[PDB]
Amino acid sequence: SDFAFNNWFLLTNTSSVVDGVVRSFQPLLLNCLWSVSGLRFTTGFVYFN
């Protein structure tokens, strides 16, 4: 809790709602905390693993 997540966005095929309360399905599993710290051009191939 208290995470700003300013960059983090919703996902919608249709027109986005504004300033509302909505329950929905989102891809929000923490999974790997970062997994990209110090990202460089040779990021390698990750395949849903």
Ligand X SMILES: *[C@@H]1O[C@H](CO)[C@@H](O)[C@H](O)[C@H]1NC(C)=O
Ligand Y SMILES: *[C@@H]1O[C@H](CO)[C@@H](O[C@@H]2O[C@H](CO)[C@@H](O[C@@H]3O[C@H](CO[C@H]4O[C@H](CO)[C@@H](O)[C@H](O)[C@@H]4O[C@H]4O[C@H](CO)[C@@H](O)[C@H](O)[C@@H]4O)[C@@H](O)[C@H](O[C@H]4O[C@H](CO)[C@@H](O)[C@H](O)[C@@H]4O[C@H]4O[C@H](CO)[C@@H](O)[C@H](O)[C@@H]4O)[C@@H]3O)[C@H](O)[C@H]2NC(C)=O)[C@H](O)[C@H]1NC(C)=O
- Which CB contacts under 8 angstroms, 24+ apart, belong to 43-47? none
Residue 18 sits at φ, ψ, to 5 deg, of -130, 135
Q: Is 7 in the site for ligand X (CB under 6 A)?
A: no
Among residue numbers 1 through 49, which ones bind a copy of itself (CB under 8 A)?
1, 5-6, 8-10, 12, 14-23, 28
How far is C-alpha 47 from the geometric centre of its chain's CA atoms?
17
Q: What is the DSSP letter of 15?
A: P
| In the complex, least distance from residue 13 CB atom to ligand X, rounded to whole angstroms | 28
Which residues sit at the interface with ligand X, rule CB under 6 A? 41-42, 47, 49
Q: Residues in the site for ligand Y, rule: CB under 6 A?
A: 11-13, 25
